[PDB]
Coordinates of C-alpha atoms and ligand atoms in Angstrom, one line a residue:
Chain A
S1 CA 87.5 112.3 103.2
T2 CA 86.0 110.5 105.8
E3 CA 82.8 109.2 103.9
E4 CA 85.5 107.3 101.5
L5 CA 86.6 105.7 104.7
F6 CA 83.4 104.6 106.2
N7 CA 81.7 103.5 102.9
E8 CA 82.9 99.8 103.1
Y9 CA 81.5 99.0 106.5
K10 CA 78.1 100.1 104.8
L11 CA 78.1 96.7 103.2
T12 CA 78.0 95.1 106.6
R13 CA 75.6 94.7 109.5
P14 CA 76.1 94.1 113.2
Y15 CA 75.3 90.5 114.6
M16 CA 75.0 88.7 118.0
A17 CA 77.3 86.3 119.4
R18 CA 77.8 84.2 122.3
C19 CA 79.4 85.9 125.3
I20 CA 80.4 83.7 128.3
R21 CA 79.7 86.3 130.9
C22 CA 76.6 88.3 130.7
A23 CA 74.8 90.3 133.3
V24 CA 73.5 87.1 134.7
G25 CA 75.1 84.1 133.0
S26 CA 75.9 82.7 129.6
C27 CA 73.9 84.6 126.8
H28 CA 73.9 85.7 123.3
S29 CA 75.2 89.2 123.3
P30 CA 74.9 92.1 120.9
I31 CA 78.2 93.6 122.2
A32 CA 80.3 90.3 122.1
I33 CA 84.0 90.5 121.9
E34 CA 86.3 88.9 119.3
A35 CA 89.6 89.9 120.1
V36 CA 91.5 92.4 122.3
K37 CA 94.9 93.7 121.0
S38 CA 97.4 95.4 123.6
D39 CA 100.6 96.0 122.0
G40 CA 100.8 99.7 121.7
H41 CA 102.8 101.4 124.5
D42 CA 101.0 104.1 126.5
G43 CA 97.8 102.3 127.3
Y44 CA 95.8 102.3 124.1
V45 CA 94.0 98.7 123.1
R46 CA 92.1 97.9 120.0
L47 CA 88.9 95.7 120.4
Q48 CA 87.1 93.9 117.6
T49 CA 83.6 93.8 118.8
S50 CA 80.3 92.4 117.5
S51 CA 78.9 95.8 117.0
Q52 CA 79.7 98.7 114.7
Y53 CA 80.6 102.1 115.1
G54 CA 80.5 105.6 113.3
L55 CA 77.2 104.6 111.4
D56 CA 73.5 105.0 112.2
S57 CA 70.9 102.3 112.2
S58 CA 70.1 102.9 108.5
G59 CA 73.5 102.8 107.0
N60 CA 74.5 106.6 106.7
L61 CA 76.9 108.3 109.1
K62 CA 76.2 109.6 112.5
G63 CA 79.3 110.8 114.5
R64 CA 79.5 109.1 117.9
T65 CA 77.3 105.8 117.8
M66 CA 77.5 102.3 118.4
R67 CA 75.4 100.3 116.2
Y68 CA 74.2 97.0 117.4
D69 CA 71.8 93.9 116.5
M70 CA 68.8 93.4 118.9
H71 CA 67.2 89.9 117.9
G72 CA 67.3 91.0 114.0
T73 CA 66.3 94.9 114.4
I74 CA 69.1 97.0 114.2
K75 CA 69.3 99.4 117.1
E76 CA 71.6 102.3 118.0
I77 CA 72.7 104.4 121.1
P78 CA 75.2 107.2 121.6
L79 CA 78.7 106.3 122.4
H80 CA 79.0 108.1 125.9
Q81 CA 76.3 105.3 126.9
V82 CA 78.9 102.7 126.3
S83 CA 81.5 102.3 128.9
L84 CA 84.2 99.6 129.3
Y85 CA 86.8 98.9 132.2
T86 CA 89.7 96.5 132.8
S87 CA 90.6 96.9 136.4
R88 CA 89.8 100.7 136.4
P89 CA 87.6 102.3 133.8
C90 CA 88.9 102.7 130.4
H91 CA 88.2 105.7 128.2
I92 CA 86.7 105.1 124.8
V93 CA 88.4 107.4 122.1
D94 CA 86.8 106.6 118.7
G95 CA 85.1 103.8 116.7
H96 CA 85.1 102.6 112.9
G97 CA 83.5 99.6 111.7
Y98 CA 83.7 96.5 113.9
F99 CA 86.8 98.1 116.0
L100 CA 87.0 100.4 118.9
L101 CA 90.1 102.1 120.4
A102 CA 90.2 102.7 124.1
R103 CA 92.9 104.1 126.7
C104 CA 92.8 101.2 129.1
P105 CA 95.0 100.3 132.2
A106 CA 96.4 96.9 132.8
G107 CA 94.3 93.9 133.8
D108 CA 93.5 90.4 133.1
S109 CA 89.9 91.0 131.7
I110 CA 87.8 93.3 129.6
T111 CA 84.1 94.1 130.3
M112 CA 81.9 96.4 128.1
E113 CA 78.5 97.3 129.0
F114 CA 75.8 99.7 128.0
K115 CA 72.4 100.4 129.7
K116 CA 69.0 100.6 127.9
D117 CA 65.7 101.3 129.8
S118 CA 65.7 98.4 132.2
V119 CA 67.8 96.0 130.6
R120 CA 71.6 95.9 131.2
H121 CA 74.0 94.5 128.7
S122 CA 77.4 93.2 129.5
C123 CA 80.1 91.0 128.0
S124 CA 83.1 90.0 130.1
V125 CA 85.9 88.1 128.3
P126 CA 89.2 86.5 129.9
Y127 CA 91.3 88.5 127.6
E128 CA 94.6 89.8 129.0
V129 CA 95.3 93.7 128.7
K130 CA 98.7 94.7 129.4
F131 CA 100.5 98.1 129.7
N132 CA 103.9 98.5 127.8
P133 CA 106.2 101.3 129.1
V134 CA 108.6 103.1 126.9
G135 CA 112.3 103.2 127.9
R136 CA 114.4 102.0 130.8
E137 CA 112.2 103.4 133.4
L138 CA 109.1 101.4 134.4
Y139 CA 106.0 103.5 135.2
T140 CA 102.4 102.4 135.2
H141 CA 100.9 105.8 134.3
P142 CA 102.4 108.1 131.6
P143 CA 104.3 111.0 133.0
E144 CA 103.7 114.5 133.2
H145 CA 107.1 115.8 131.9
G146 CA 110.4 114.3 130.7
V147 CA 112.0 113.5 127.2
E148 CA 110.7 111.9 124.1
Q149 CA 111.4 108.4 122.8
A150 CA 110.0 107.1 119.6
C151 CA 107.2 104.8 120.1
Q152 CA 104.3 102.7 118.4
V153 CA 101.0 103.3 119.5
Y154 CA 97.7 102.5 117.7
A155 CA 96.7 105.4 115.3
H156 CA 93.8 107.4 115.9
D157 CA 92.5 108.0 112.6
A158 CA 90.7 105.4 110.5
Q159 CA 93.2 105.6 107.3
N160 CA 93.1 102.7 104.8
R161 CA 96.4 101.0 105.2
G162 CA 97.5 97.4 104.1
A163 CA 95.9 95.3 106.6
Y164 CA 92.5 93.5 106.1
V165 CA 89.9 91.1 107.6
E166 CA 87.8 88.8 105.5
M167 CA 83.9 89.2 105.0
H168 CA 81.4 86.5 104.0
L169 CA 77.8 85.5 103.5
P170 CA 75.7 85.4 106.7
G171 CA 74.2 82.1 107.1
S172 CA 70.7 80.8 108.2
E173 CA 70.0 82.5 111.5
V174 CA 67.2 80.4 112.9
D175 CA 64.2 82.1 114.5
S176 CA 61.3 80.8 116.5
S177 CA 59.2 84.1 116.9
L178 CA 58.2 83.4 113.2
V179 CA 56.6 80.1 113.8
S180 CA 53.4 79.9 115.7
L181 CA 50.5 77.6 116.0
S182 CA 47.0 77.7 114.3
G183 CA 44.2 76.3 116.1
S184 CA 45.0 72.9 114.6
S185 CA 48.2 73.2 112.5
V186 CA 51.5 75.0 112.3
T187 CA 51.9 78.6 111.0
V188 CA 55.1 80.5 109.6
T189 CA 54.9 84.4 109.2
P190 CA 58.1 85.6 107.7
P191 CA 58.7 89.1 107.8
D192 CA 57.9 91.7 105.2
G193 CA 60.9 92.1 102.5
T194 CA 62.5 89.1 103.9
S195 CA 62.3 85.4 102.9
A196 CA 62.3 82.6 105.4
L197 CA 62.7 78.8 104.7
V198 CA 61.0 76.0 106.6
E199 CA 62.3 72.4 107.5
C200 CA 59.9 70.0 109.2
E201 CA 59.9 66.4 110.0
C202 CA 56.0 65.7 110.3
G203 CA 55.4 63.9 107.1
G204 CA 58.4 62.2 105.6
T205 CA 61.1 64.9 104.9
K206 CA 59.5 68.2 104.1
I207 CA 61.2 71.4 103.2
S208 CA 60.1 74.7 101.6
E209 CA 61.3 78.3 100.9
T210 CA 58.4 80.7 101.3
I211 CA 58.2 84.7 100.7
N212 CA 55.9 87.2 102.5
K213 CA 53.2 84.8 103.0
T214 CA 51.6 83.6 106.3
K215 CA 51.8 80.1 105.0
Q216 CA 50.4 77.1 107.0
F217 CA 51.3 73.6 106.8
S218 CA 49.0 70.4 107.3
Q219 CA 50.0 67.2 109.1
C220 CA 52.5 69.1 111.5
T221 CA 50.8 69.3 115.0
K222 CA 53.3 70.5 117.6
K223 CA 55.6 73.4 116.5
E224 CA 58.8 71.7 117.9
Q225 CA 59.2 69.9 114.7
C226 CA 59.7 72.8 112.4
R227 CA 62.5 75.3 112.3
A228 CA 62.0 78.7 110.4
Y229 CA 65.4 80.2 109.3
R230 CA 65.9 83.6 108.1
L231 CA 67.7 84.8 104.9
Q232 CA 69.8 88.0 104.1
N233 CA 71.6 87.9 100.8
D234 CA 72.9 91.3 101.3
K235 CA 74.7 92.7 104.3
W236 CA 78.0 91.1 104.8
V237 CA 79.1 89.9 108.4
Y238 CA 82.6 89.1 109.8
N239 CA 84.2 85.6 109.5
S240 CA 83.4 84.7 113.1
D241 CA 83.5 81.5 114.7
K242 CA 80.4 82.5 116.7
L243 CA 78.1 82.4 113.6
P244 CA 77.2 79.5 111.3
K245 CA 78.2 79.9 107.8
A246 CA 76.4 79.5 104.2
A247 CA 76.5 76.8 101.5
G248 CA 79.3 77.3 98.9
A249 CA 82.7 79.1 98.6
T250 CA 81.1 81.6 101.2
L251 CA 83.5 84.7 100.3
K252 CA 82.2 88.1 99.5
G253 CA 85.1 90.5 100.0
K254 CA 87.6 91.9 102.4
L255 CA 87.7 95.2 104.5
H256 CA 90.5 97.2 105.9
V257 CA 90.9 97.5 109.6
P258 CA 91.0 101.0 111.2
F259 CA 93.5 102.3 113.9
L260 CA 96.6 100.1 113.1
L261 CA 99.9 100.4 114.9
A262 CA 102.0 103.3 113.7
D263 CA 105.4 105.0 114.7
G264 CA 105.0 107.9 116.9
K265 CA 106.6 109.9 119.8
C266 CA 106.0 109.2 123.5
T267 CA 107.0 111.2 126.6
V268 CA 108.9 109.1 129.1
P269 CA 110.1 110.2 132.7
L270 CA 113.6 111.2 133.6
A271 CA 115.2 109.8 136.7
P272 CA 116.8 111.9 139.6
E273 CA 120.3 112.6 138.8
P274 CA 122.8 110.1 140.3
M275 CA 125.1 111.5 142.9
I276 CA 128.7 110.3 141.9
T277 CA 131.6 109.9 144.2
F278 CA 134.9 109.6 142.7
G279 CA 138.1 107.8 143.9
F280 CA 141.2 106.3 142.7
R281 CA 140.2 103.9 139.8
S282 CA 136.7 103.7 141.2
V283 CA 133.4 105.4 141.1
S284 CA 130.5 105.4 143.5
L285 CA 127.1 105.8 142.6
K286 CA 124.0 107.1 145.0
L287 CA 120.7 106.2 143.4
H288 CA 117.3 107.3 144.4
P289 CA 114.8 106.0 142.0
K290 CA 111.2 107.6 142.0
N291 CA 109.9 104.5 140.0
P292 CA 112.0 101.3 139.0
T293 CA 114.9 102.2 136.8
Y294 CA 117.3 100.1 134.9
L295 CA 120.8 100.7 135.6
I296 CA 123.2 99.2 132.7
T297 CA 127.0 99.5 133.0
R298 CA 129.8 98.1 130.7
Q299 CA 133.4 98.6 130.4
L300 CA 135.4 99.9 127.4
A301 CA 137.9 96.9 126.9
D302 CA 138.0 93.6 125.3
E303 CA 135.9 92.1 128.1
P304 CA 132.9 94.4 128.8
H305 CA 131.8 92.8 132.0
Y306 CA 128.2 94.3 131.5
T307 CA 126.0 94.6 134.5
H308 CA 122.2 94.9 134.1
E309 CA 120.0 95.8 136.9
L310 CA 116.5 96.8 137.7
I311 CA 116.8 99.0 140.6
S312 CA 113.5 100.3 142.7
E313 CA 114.9 101.2 146.0
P314 CA 117.4 103.8 147.3
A315 CA 120.9 101.9 146.7
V316 CA 124.5 102.6 146.4
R317 CA 126.7 100.8 143.6
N318 CA 130.3 100.7 143.5
Chain B
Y1 CA 100.5 85.5 114.8
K2 CA 96.8 85.6 114.6
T3 CA 94.7 82.3 114.7
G4 CA 92.1 82.7 112.1
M5 CA 89.0 80.4 112.2
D6 CA 86.2 79.7 109.7
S7 CA 82.6 79.7 110.8
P8 CA 81.3 76.2 111.9
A9 CA 79.7 74.2 109.1
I10 CA 76.6 72.6 110.4
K11 CA 74.4 70.1 108.7
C12 CA 71.3 68.8 110.4
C13 CA 71.0 65.1 110.2
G14 CA 73.9 64.7 107.8
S15 CA 77.8 64.2 107.9
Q16 CA 80.2 66.6 106.5
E17 CA 83.8 66.1 105.4
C18 CA 87.1 67.9 105.7
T19 CA 88.2 69.6 102.6
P20 CA 91.7 71.0 103.2
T21 CA 93.0 74.5 102.1
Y22 CA 96.7 74.2 102.7
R23 CA 96.7 77.4 104.8
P24 CA 99.6 77.4 107.3
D25 CA 99.3 74.9 110.2
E26 CA 95.6 74.3 108.9
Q27 CA 93.9 72.1 111.4
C28 CA 90.6 70.6 110.6
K29 CA 88.3 68.2 112.6
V30 CA 84.6 66.9 112.2
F31 CA 82.5 66.6 115.3
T32 CA 79.5 64.5 115.8
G33 CA 76.8 64.7 118.3
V34 CA 76.1 68.4 118.3
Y35 CA 73.0 70.2 119.2
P36 CA 73.8 74.0 118.6
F37 CA 71.7 76.9 119.8
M38 CA 71.2 80.2 118.1
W39 CA 69.7 83.3 119.5
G40 CA 66.4 82.4 118.1
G41 CA 66.1 78.9 119.5
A42 CA 67.8 75.5 118.7
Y43 CA 69.3 75.2 115.2
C44 CA 68.3 71.7 114.1
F45 CA 65.6 69.3 115.0
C46 CA 67.5 66.2 115.1
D47 CA 68.7 65.1 118.5
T48 CA 71.9 63.0 117.3
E49 CA 73.5 62.4 113.8
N50 CA 74.3 66.3 113.5
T51 CA 77.7 67.6 112.4
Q52 CA 79.8 70.5 112.9
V53 CA 83.2 71.3 111.4
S54 CA 86.0 73.3 113.1
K55 CA 88.7 74.8 110.9
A56 CA 91.6 76.9 112.1
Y57 CA 94.7 78.1 110.5
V58 CA 97.6 80.7 111.5
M59 CA 98.1 84.0 109.7
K60 CA 100.2 86.8 110.7
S61 CA 98.9 89.9 112.6
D62 CA 97.7 92.9 111.2
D63 CA 100.4 94.9 112.7
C64 CA 103.1 93.0 111.1
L65 CA 104.4 95.9 109.1
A66 CA 105.3 98.2 111.8
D67 CA 106.1 95.5 114.6
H68 CA 108.6 92.8 113.2
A69 CA 112.0 91.6 113.9
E70 CA 114.2 91.0 111.0
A71 CA 116.8 87.8 111.3
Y72 CA 120.1 88.4 109.4
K73 CA 123.3 86.7 108.8
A74 CA 126.5 88.8 108.8
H75 CA 130.1 88.0 107.8
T76 CA 133.2 89.7 106.5
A77 CA 132.7 93.6 107.6
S78 CA 133.9 96.5 105.9
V79 CA 135.6 99.5 107.7
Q80 CA 135.1 102.9 106.5
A81 CA 136.2 106.3 108.2
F82 CA 135.5 110.0 107.8
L83 CA 139.0 111.5 108.0
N84 CA 140.0 115.1 108.1
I85 CA 143.3 115.2 106.5
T86 CA 145.7 118.3 106.3
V87 CA 149.1 117.9 104.3
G88 CA 150.8 121.3 104.1
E89 CA 148.0 123.5 105.0
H90 CA 145.6 122.1 102.4
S91 CA 142.7 120.3 104.2
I92 CA 140.0 117.9 103.0
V93 CA 137.2 116.1 104.6
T94 CA 136.8 112.8 102.7
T95 CA 135.2 109.5 103.7
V96 CA 138.2 107.2 103.2
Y97 CA 137.8 103.4 102.9
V98 CA 140.3 101.5 104.7
Chain C
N1 CA 102.1 121.8 113.9
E2 CA 102.1 117.9 114.2
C3 CA 100.9 115.8 117.0
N4 CA 103.0 113.0 118.6
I5 CA 100.3 110.5 117.8
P6 CA 99.7 110.0 114.3
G7 CA 96.1 109.8 114.0
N8 CA 95.3 113.1 115.6
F9 CA 94.3 116.6 114.2
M10 CA 95.8 119.5 116.1
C11 CA 93.4 122.4 117.2
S12 CA 94.1 126.1 117.7
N13 CA 95.3 125.6 121.3
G14 CA 97.4 122.7 120.4
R15 CA 94.6 120.0 121.7
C16 CA 95.1 117.0 119.7
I17 CA 91.6 115.5 118.8
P18 CA 91.2 112.3 116.7
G19 CA 91.4 113.0 112.9
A20 CA 87.8 111.5 112.3
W21 CA 86.5 114.5 114.4
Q22 CA 87.5 117.2 111.9
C23 CA 84.5 118.4 109.9
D24 CA 81.8 116.3 111.5
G25 CA 79.2 118.9 112.7
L26 CA 80.2 118.7 116.2
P27 CA 82.4 121.5 117.9
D28 CA 85.5 119.8 120.0
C29 CA 88.3 122.3 119.6
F30 CA 88.2 125.9 121.3
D31 CA 86.5 128.4 118.7
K32 CA 85.6 125.3 116.5
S33 CA 88.9 125.0 114.7
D34 CA 87.6 121.5 113.6
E35 CA 84.8 123.3 111.8
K36 CA 86.3 126.2 109.9
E37 CA 87.1 124.9 106.4
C38 CA 85.0 121.9 105.4
Chain D
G1 CA 106.5 78.9 121.7
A2 CA 109.9 80.6 120.9
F3 CA 111.3 83.0 118.5
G4 CA 110.6 82.2 115.0
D5 CA 107.3 80.1 115.2
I6 CA 106.1 82.3 112.6
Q7 CA 108.7 82.6 109.7
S8 CA 107.7 84.6 106.7
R9 CA 110.5 85.1 104.1
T10 CA 109.9 88.8 103.6
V11 CA 107.5 91.2 105.0
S12 CA 105.1 90.8 101.9
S13 CA 106.0 87.3 101.1
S14 CA 102.4 85.7 101.3
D15 CA 103.9 82.3 102.2
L16 CA 104.7 81.7 105.7
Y17 CA 105.9 78.9 107.7
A18 CA 104.1 78.5 110.8
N19 CA 104.8 75.6 113.7
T20 CA 102.5 77.1 116.6
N21 CA 101.2 73.8 118.4
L22 CA 97.6 74.2 117.3
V23 CA 95.2 71.6 118.5
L24 CA 91.4 71.8 117.7
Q25 CA 89.2 71.0 120.7
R26 CA 85.6 69.8 121.0
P27 CA 82.8 72.3 121.2
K28 CA 80.6 72.9 124.3
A29 CA 77.3 71.1 124.1
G30 CA 75.0 73.7 122.8
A31 CA 77.4 76.3 121.5
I32 CA 78.6 77.7 118.1
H33 CA 82.2 78.3 118.4
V34 CA 85.8 76.8 117.6
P35 CA 87.7 75.9 120.3
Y36 CA 91.5 75.6 119.9
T37 CA 94.6 75.5 122.3
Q38 CA 98.1 76.5 121.2
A39 CA 101.3 77.5 122.5
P40 CA 101.6 81.3 122.9
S41 CA 103.4 83.8 120.9
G42 CA 107.1 83.2 120.7
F43 CA 107.8 86.7 119.4
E44 CA 106.1 88.0 122.7
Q45 CA 107.9 85.5 124.8
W46 CA 111.1 86.5 123.0
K47 CA 110.2 90.1 124.1
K48 CA 109.7 89.3 127.6
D49 CA 113.1 87.6 128.0
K50 CA 115.6 89.8 125.7
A51 CA 118.8 90.0 127.2
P52 CA 119.9 93.6 126.5
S53 CA 120.9 95.0 123.1
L54 CA 124.3 95.2 121.6
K55 CA 124.2 98.8 122.1
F56 CA 124.9 98.2 125.7
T57 CA 126.9 95.0 125.8
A58 CA 129.5 95.5 122.8
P59 CA 133.1 95.2 123.9
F60 CA 135.6 98.1 123.2
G61 CA 132.7 100.7 123.6
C62 CA 130.8 100.3 120.4
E63 CA 128.0 102.3 119.2
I64 CA 125.6 100.2 117.4
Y65 CA 122.9 101.8 114.9
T66 CA 120.3 100.9 112.8
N67 CA 119.5 101.8 109.1
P68 CA 122.8 100.6 107.8
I69 CA 123.5 97.7 110.6
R70 CA 126.9 99.3 111.7
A71 CA 129.1 100.0 114.6
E72 CA 130.6 103.1 115.6
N73 CA 134.0 104.2 117.3
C74 CA 135.3 100.7 118.4
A75 CA 138.5 101.7 119.9
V76 CA 140.6 98.6 118.7
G77 CA 143.3 98.1 116.2
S78 CA 145.3 100.6 114.3
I79 CA 145.1 102.2 110.8
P80 CA 148.2 102.2 108.8
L81 CA 148.7 104.8 106.0
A82 CA 150.6 105.4 102.8
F83 CA 151.4 108.8 101.5
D84 CA 152.6 109.1 97.9
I85 CA 153.8 112.8 97.9
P86 CA 154.9 114.5 94.9
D87 CA 158.1 116.2 94.7
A88 CA 156.6 119.6 94.3
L89 CA 155.5 120.1 98.0
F90 CA 158.9 119.9 99.4
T91 CA 159.8 123.5 99.8
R92 CA 163.5 124.3 100.3
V93 CA 165.2 125.2 103.6
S94 CA 166.0 128.9 103.1
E95 CA 162.3 129.7 102.0
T96 CA 161.4 128.8 105.7
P97 CA 162.6 130.2 109.0
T98 CA 165.5 128.5 110.6
Chain E
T1 CA 96.9 98.2 84.3
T2 CA 94.6 95.9 85.9
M3 CA 91.1 94.5 84.5
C4 CA 88.6 93.2 86.8
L5 CA 85.8 90.8 86.3
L6 CA 81.9 90.4 86.5
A7 CA 81.4 88.1 83.5
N8 CA 83.7 87.9 80.5
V9 CA 83.8 91.5 80.4
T10 CA 87.2 92.9 81.5
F11 CA 86.2 96.3 82.4
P12 CA 88.6 98.7 84.0
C13 CA 88.8 98.3 87.7
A14 CA 88.3 102.3 88.5
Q15 CA 85.1 102.2 86.4
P16 CA 82.8 99.7 87.8
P17 CA 79.3 99.1 86.2
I18 CA 77.5 99.0 89.5
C19 CA 77.2 100.7 92.8
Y20 CA 76.0 99.7 96.2
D21 CA 73.6 102.6 96.6
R22 CA 71.9 101.1 93.5
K23 CA 72.1 97.3 94.0
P24 CA 72.3 95.6 97.4
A25 CA 73.9 92.1 96.5
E26 CA 75.1 92.5 93.1
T27 CA 77.9 94.8 94.2
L28 CA 78.8 92.0 96.9
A29 CA 78.8 89.3 94.2
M30 CA 81.1 91.3 92.2
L31 CA 83.4 91.8 94.9
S32 CA 83.1 88.0 95.7
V33 CA 84.8 86.8 92.6
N34 CA 87.4 89.5 92.6
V35 CA 89.1 88.9 96.0
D36 CA 92.6 87.5 94.4
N37 CA 93.2 91.0 92.8
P38 CA 96.0 93.4 93.3
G39 CA 93.7 96.3 92.3
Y40 CA 90.9 95.2 94.5
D41 CA 91.2 98.5 96.5
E42 CA 90.6 100.5 93.3
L43 CA 87.6 98.1 92.4
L44 CA 86.5 98.8 96.0
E45 CA 86.4 102.6 96.4
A46 CA 85.3 102.7 92.8
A47 CA 82.4 100.2 93.4
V48 CA 80.9 102.0 96.2
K49 CA 80.6 105.7 94.5
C50 CA 78.8 106.7 91.4
Ligands
LIG1 CA1 84.6 118.5 114.9

């Protein structure tokens, strides 16, 4: 029953947003990044991007795809062309809607990039990504063998749960490949099956909504004075701050978010066994930690005198 | 938390206003002297007297259900034991309250 | 059986692939156990 | 910036108190975004500090558990007992060895 | 039970009159006015499929 899950991001389209670090400078990117969440334990993060996943360029379902917005025309590539990295390369697991799930190492940035023919697209964001160990032994890469603590990692399926984001009317995405000059006037050519609207300032205050017609206007000489917007009544976007909004109550629905933080099981390491030397009312502890290990002691009386210590070197505690 | 942000309301050669919603910690401010850009060129034709409204509010995170901390108050406890009593080779195992 | 991570489907060999990869028209588990009963 | 900057009354209360020091900032000249500046998650900062649990620090060697909040096996105090024994259980002398 | 709205026609939320594969923007407008609804997920998964 995956088609019942995917059917709500069919109402939506990918968009372009402002990314601060692109391949050269500051650009408008089709793969812009809204938020990175890293609160699952063993290295799984969940990116909310400005692209869409698990859908094809039409609206139907293709398996491992990124769907993006390239200056209005929606394009697509396979998922194995898209790579992202924090410090080391991350590994993309799955995608659903505006959301992506990756297995990432710890780092102070996220950079997603894909490669078209001779254009390289990138988007680096200053979003901190952390790695959260489980248990009282602080590893950096999850181990090979040990025991199994309970944990909380981002679930890998796109099951509808009780958490939502809010969708809206896309506003007037302005264009300038529409407006062009005649030999003596200004010419607006809206695309087929799409209505534009034109605001100019060459007479007094001029404004028009045009449909499907190469519609010239007299008294406008230079095309710097006319802005040709674009309109799409269908096809929701996210409530982004990198997009402008429409006029009047703005709201069209809400969608569920995939890959929520669920309870699970995680494998944790097991420290080398301490070597215990006994004496008269005293206990010595030889400790050889492989990776840093909390020692926590307490006494079973009315004053516990608890001791809490991160130990990362070979140490003897009496 | 999760700082939610509404899209910027932009009017060309106009002036917006602040309409509140009484969302939690809902800040709103109106900025004048703005010449915004889209991907397909500039957004207004006016140099000045344009207006952009920022609106932000705090809502709680999507993972609030499985990752939250419960603040309680406790007083006047109640002790309860699982005894195993044998009186004259007749044994029971009963939760006694003490 | 059941995987340790909740969103995962368990293949024939015990390999846990994501649950949206079951019955997708693409073979991921050994002997296509993601493509047996669709 | 500390524990409880979000205060939702229950998990599904749909009315949360929030004091997160949110301040809106002026957008960069030529860009459509909503720039803010607020204090970080006090819940995360509580999780970074977190003096250890009562499972490891409790006096008398208690064993704190979760689903009912309870302690176990705290070796403190003493239980008195009252036995109201019927007279039928008292066997006579010569029906036992001596 | 829960009754959803497109007009003054309180239809059952499991039985919508329109679907997205028929109409591009009327379904989105029907979802627009019915956001404050406890049976919005029922209206949602019914309003996709015919
Ligand atoms: Ca498969």
